[PDB]
From a paper:
In the human pathogen [name], the sodium-pumping NADH:quinone oxidoreductase (Na+-NQR) generates a sodium gradient by a so far unknown mechanism. Na+-NQR is composed of three integral membrane subunits, NqrB, NqrD, and NqrE, and three hydrophilic subunits, NqrA, NqrC, and [name]. The six subunits NqrA, B, C, D, E, and F of Na+-NQR harbor a unique set of cofactors that shuttle the electrons from NADH twice across the membrane to quinone. Here we show that ion pumping in Na+-NQR is driven by large conformational changes coupling electron transfer to ion translocation.
Subunit [name] consists of two domains, an amino-terminal [2Fe-2S] ferredoxin-like and a carboxy-terminal FAD-binding domain, which is similar to ferredoxin-NADPH reductases (FNRs). The mode of NADH binding was further characterized by X-ray structures of the isolated FNR-like domain of [name], as well as of a variant of [name] lacking the C-terminal F406, which is important for binding of NADH.
Residue numbers in the entry: 128 to 404
Write the structure that this text describes.
């Protein structure tokens, strides 16, 4: 029994983006999971049946759900299952586990396949529910150097990026040069804006930027647009005197990971300085 297990209580499970919920868990007796930033826990689910029509999805985020009739879906799970989720809190955010969980719907080109089992279960959870977690685990840990760090995130990849960045600035009091580049579709898909604005205001070695690939009329957006690998290249790495000497930490959807890795490699960054997972 080397691995520990906690039956947690759901504090909240609010949408932060159209397809991402922030699951916040309270550890029993106020204790903390002894994890490292970049690490993960596992959630286990009992057998269950959930309906997407019962999810709490705010009107602000419902547009695509209505557009693609995503509330049609139901998920029946006959036997227990288990999956990993990355911590979004850093280790001195005690007493809690914060996760960012993307709902894995059936793909639009394959609309009658079963919905994602664990994420549909997690999206059914409401304040007061119980959630069993085990861990902690991980190998996506920061290197112990003084090298500049470039963090690149998309989607639910926000979670380990937040954990890493907060761990550096708050627990380690790092003075390393640090930037964070987050790509999202439109302004409603952004979140943790207060957290990262807060850190950038208080730490002259940290800056961050969001790029919107499809800003909406209501966003009145005048920030960066496009895909985050082009925005990072055009606005920072193209003129960087030694990009190969930075450490790049990233977590995003597969298409973002591939485009970023290709852009970094074409700049001469070696695989040893490109960290994922
Ligand atoms: C170390 C680690 C960290 C992770 N951290 C996070 C995190 O922070 N956030 C997060 O959201 N995820 C994270 N994940 C991923 C997570 O563990 C799950 O893989 C994710 O939630 C999807 O699992 P699921 O059970 O919901 O979907 P699954 O049931 O595994 O299904 C996956 C997808 O396949 C589709 N599908 C189902 N059946 C078929 C079929 N017959 N044909 C075609 N397609 C089909 C489903 O509709 C769904 O879209 C992490 C994974 C690892 C390993
Ligand atoms: Mg949002």
């Amino acid at each position: 029994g080397p691995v520990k297990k906690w039956e947690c209580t759901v504090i909240s499970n609010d949408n932060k983006a159209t397809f991402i919920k922030e699951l916040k868990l309270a550890i029993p007796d106020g204790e903390s999971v002894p994890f490292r930033a970049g690490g993960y826990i596992q959630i286990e689910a009992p057998a269950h049946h959930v309906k997407y029509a019962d999810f709490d999805v705010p009107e602000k985020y419902r547009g695509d759900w209505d557009k693609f009739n995503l509330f049609r879906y139901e998920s029946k799970v006959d036997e227990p299952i288990i999956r990993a989720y990355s911590m979004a809190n850093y280790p001195e955010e005690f007493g809690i586990i914060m996760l960012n969980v993307r709902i894995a719907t059936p793909p639009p080109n394959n609309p009658n396949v079963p919905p994602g089992q664990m994420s549909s279960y997690i999206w059914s959870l409401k304040a007061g529910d119980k959630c069993t977690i085990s861990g902690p685990f991980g190998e996506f840990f920061a290197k112990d150097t003084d090298a500049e760090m470039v963090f690149i995130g998309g989607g639910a990849g926000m979670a380990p990026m937040r954990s890493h960045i907060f761990d550096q600035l708050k627990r380690l009091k790092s003075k390393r040069k640090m930037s964070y580049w987050y790509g999202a579709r439109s302004k409603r898909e952004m979140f943790y804006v207060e957290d990262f604005d807060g850190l950038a205001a208080e730490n002259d070695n940290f800056v961050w930027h969001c790029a919107l690939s499809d800003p909406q009329p209501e966003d009145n957006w005048t920030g960066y647009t496009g895909f985050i690998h082009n925005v990072l290249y055009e606005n920072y790495l193209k003129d960087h005197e030694a990009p190969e000497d930075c450490e790049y930490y990233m977590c995003g959807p597969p298409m973002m990971n591939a485009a970023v890795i290709n852009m970094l490699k074409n700049l001469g960054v070696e695989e040893e300085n490109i960290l994922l997972d």
